Design a protein around this nucleic acid. Structure first.
Length: 93
DNA sequence: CAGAGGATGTGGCTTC
DNA sequence: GAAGCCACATCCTCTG
């Protein structure tokens, strides 16, 4: 508890063990969900919510476009880009 | 199956 | 004991 979504994802990406589950992809910002279910599973877990799936998760991310927190890497599959613009905003009191 | 966004609901923190 | 917003969860009818 006491956490956002866009945070959780960072936590995982800092651990190179989870590269099986979610790995940084090249350019600053870009990453891909190699396993978009083991992700969805651990999220419900951390948020004590055992009905969780990529279906509801990606909707939660689709809100972060308007907030300029992260953006969809168009065409490429299960891939996403963190957005420093609105990241720096949520990182202020 | 993605991926998209509207609609409604929800546990969360709080102002009168 | 109630109205305020917050960031999700739940759902849903598109589309490729």
């Amino acid at each position: 508890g006491q956490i956002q979504l866009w945070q959780f994802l960072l936590e995982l990406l800092s651990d190179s063990a989870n590269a099986s589950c979610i790995t940084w992809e090249g350019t600053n910002g870009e990453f891909k969900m190699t396993d978009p279910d083991e992700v969805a599973r651990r999220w419900g877990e951390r948020k004590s919510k055992p009905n969780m799936n990529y279906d509801k998760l990606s909707r939660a991310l689709r809100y972060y476009y308007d907030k300029n927190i992260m953006t969809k890497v168009h065409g490429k599959r299960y891939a996403y880009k963190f957005d420093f613009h609105g990241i720096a905003q949520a990182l202020q009191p």
